[PDB]
């Protein structure tokens, strides 16, 4: 029984450690995504500023 409740604890536990080890990996892939994507828009806010600048000069000729 205690010889066995406890071998049960061992098992249920390893499974959790194993599952949480996969989620750690999942989250860090997801971080690379969010980071790559956050720091790229840094560019996208510049091309947008260049544009609306061109569109105002083009709006002032027409």
């Amino acid at each position: 029984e205690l010889l066995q409740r406890c071998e049960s604890l061992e098992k249920k536990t390893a499974t959790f450690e194993n599952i949480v080890c996969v989620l750690n990996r999942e989250v860090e892939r997801v971080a690379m995504t969010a980071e790559a994507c956050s720091r790229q828009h840094r560019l996208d806010q510049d091309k947008i500023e260049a544009l609306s600048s061109k569109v105002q000069q083009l709006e002032r000729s027409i």
Binding site: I19, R25, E26
Partner: protein
């Protein structure tokens, strides 16, 4: 006591890195890890798939290769 999917997910703790497919998506499609390379195996039908590339769908590739699978039926 806890979803099959998650038991299948736990076998991925050893999965090799830089495999361009999700552990989550593999276990979700019914496959658990074999512990060899990137070969995984469907607990239901015994279907073995390896050498995974980007944009591969474990769900689709399961249906395509063995549609008689009581599991794949969903």
């Amino acid at each position: 006591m806890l979803s099959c999917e998650l038991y299948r997910m736990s076998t991925y703790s050893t999965f090799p890195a830089g495999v361009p497919v999700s552990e989550r998506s593999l276990a979700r499609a019914g496959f658990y890890y074999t512990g060899v390379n990137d070969k995984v195996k469907c607990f239901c039908c015994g279907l073995m798939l390896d050498n995974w590339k980007r944009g591969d769908s474990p769900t689709e590739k399961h249906k395509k290769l063995y549609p008689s699978c009581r599991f794949v039926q969903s």
